[PDB]
């Protein structure tokens, strides 16, 4: 997202406004305002690693924009929007993740490698791979009888088609010591 | 749901795995290690587009 | 299938480590364990 000091009314603010957002969700209901539309209206930009060197990004828009003029204890400890220099803003920080890691529920609550493990195992998890399975001759095909969408989901799965084509079932799980088996 | 991006070659679906490489036409300076006559080198891997 | 069409190979200083420059471009978790660890990047 592009951020500009350019705002008659107040501070440095993200070009994209609640009007563009509804302008997009209008097109979301139609299935005229595409991604290209945000790109040509210079609201959003493409930044490679070399260019990244010279920019300054905010993680959250709203949380990292207007300054201070009680606090929930259960929430994680967050930093501030000290920067008045902000050139860009992060669309969503969860987007730093790839296809496999994007199915991990609360990966921000796991030890680093446990996440690295899941993004390797899910590749070996059974489920419906394609709906046309019955019409194709492949060496080996494994299809789950009764696949279930997960009760705990990621906003990113929407795009990953995961709830439409799942890799498991929601099992009733007890974490207990039983027969020692 | 099938996204494409693959090829069908003599029956089988083949993926062209993206191959990482260092960018060319790039000026880079490196300190050549303790036992060396040359102390530093400026390299440019020049190649045509 | 999806994660296979976003796979990167790196053949042959400290390549296996997750670099700062990998932020937002490559997945910090999706990499193999053993031999290819950190040489197989996922977008």
């Amino acid at each position: 997202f592009i951020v500009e000091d350019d705002e008659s009314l107040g501070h440095k603010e993200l070009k994209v406004r609640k009007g563009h957002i509804a302008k997009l969700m209008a097109t979301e209901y139609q299935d005229e305002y595409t991604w290209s539309s945000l790109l040509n209206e210079g609201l959003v930009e493409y930044i490679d690693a070399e260019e990244e060197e010279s920019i300054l990004i905010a993680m959250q828009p709203e949380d990292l924009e207007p300054a201070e003029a009680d606090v929930d204890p259960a929430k994680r400890i967050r930093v501030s929007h000290h920067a008045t220099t902000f050139t860009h803003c992060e669309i969503h920080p969860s987007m730093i993740l790839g296809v496999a890691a994007s199915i991990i529920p609360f990966p921000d609550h796991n030890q680093s490698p446990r996440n690295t493990y899941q993004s390797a195992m899910g590749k070996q998890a059974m489920g419906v791979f394609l709906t046309n399975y019955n019409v194709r001759m492949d060496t080996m095909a494994n299809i789950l009888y009764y696949p279930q969408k997960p009760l705990g989901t990621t906003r990113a799965m929407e795009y990953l088609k995961f709830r439409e084509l799942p890799a498991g079932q929601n099992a009733i799980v007890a974490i207990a010591c039983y027969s020692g088996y | 749901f099938d996204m494409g991006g693959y090829f069908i070659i003599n029956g089988s679906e083949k993926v062209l795995i993206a191959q990482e490489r260092s960018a060319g036409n790039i000026v880079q300076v490196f300190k050549k290690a303790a036992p060396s006559p040359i102390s530093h080198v400026a390299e440019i891997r020049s190649a045509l587009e | 299938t999806l994660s296979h069409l976003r796979r990167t190979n790196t053949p042959i200083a400290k390549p296996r480590q997750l670099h700062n420059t990998h932020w937002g471009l490559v997945c910090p978790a999706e990499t193999p364990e053993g031999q290819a660890c950190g040489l197989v990047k996922n977008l």
Binding site: R17, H20, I21, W35, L38, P61, E62, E65, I91, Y159 | - | -
Partner: peptide
Amino acid sequence: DESAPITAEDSWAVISAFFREKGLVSQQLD
């Protein structure tokens, strides 16, 4: 109020559009 600042939930409306257009194998195809 069509020029009001964007919230955190609104970033998903942009992400929706990114994928509506590009898809997941954008790079392989392009």
